[PDB]
């Protein structure tokens, strides 16, 4: 059982790294959109 | 103890699925905003 | 081994809370950008 628990923990950790990588990508795209809205607002005002 | 560990792992996995679902929703809304900034920019230029 | 598993689970849970906090922050900034695109569109139309 301890063994199956150990391999399950590795699969949860693997998934956590995939999630972390997805968040990093989202954060950068989100920062690009914030910059984009800023230039558009500055141009129309 | 192995038992409590097993039920704890299920709660961590449950939480991981909730996180995954939240990211999927964020990704789609983020893609809608990127499209939105694109139409606004195209219209003002 | 059960012991190392227990401390590993706590580290996975710690990481899950950091992820949850990051998502909450992303969600609020994403809602600010949606509001921003709305005001810009309303102004140019
Ligand atoms: Cl956005
Ligand atoms: Y292994
Ligand atoms: Y169970
Ligand atoms: Y402990
Ligand atoms: Y997680």
Burial C2-27 (b: 16+ CB within 10 A, else e): eeebeebbeebeebbeebeebbeebe
Q: Compute the distance between CA of residue B1 and CA of residue A2 in angstroms, rounded to an integer.
A: 10
Third-level CATH fold of B1-45: 1.20.5
Resolution of the structure, angstroms: 1.7
Among C16, C26, C37, beta carbon nearest to B33: C37
Exp. method: X-ray
Q: Is B9 on the interface with C (CB under 8 A)?
A: yes
- B16 DSSP assignment: H
With a CB cutoff of 8 Å and minimum separation 6, the contacts of A10 are: none
Retrieve residue A45's tokens: 């005002």
Q: Rounded to the nearest whole angstrom, what is the distance from the C-alpha of residue B2 to the centroid of ligand 3? A: 11
Query: Contacts of residue C19 in chain A, CB cutoff 8 Å?
Result: 16, 19-20, 23
């Amino acid at each position: 059982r301890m063994k199956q628990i150990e391999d399950k923990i590795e699969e949860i950790e693997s998934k956590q790294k995939k999630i972390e990588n997805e968040i990093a990508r989202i954060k950068k795209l989100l920062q690009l959109t914030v910059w984009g809205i800023k230039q558009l607002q500055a141009r129309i005002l």
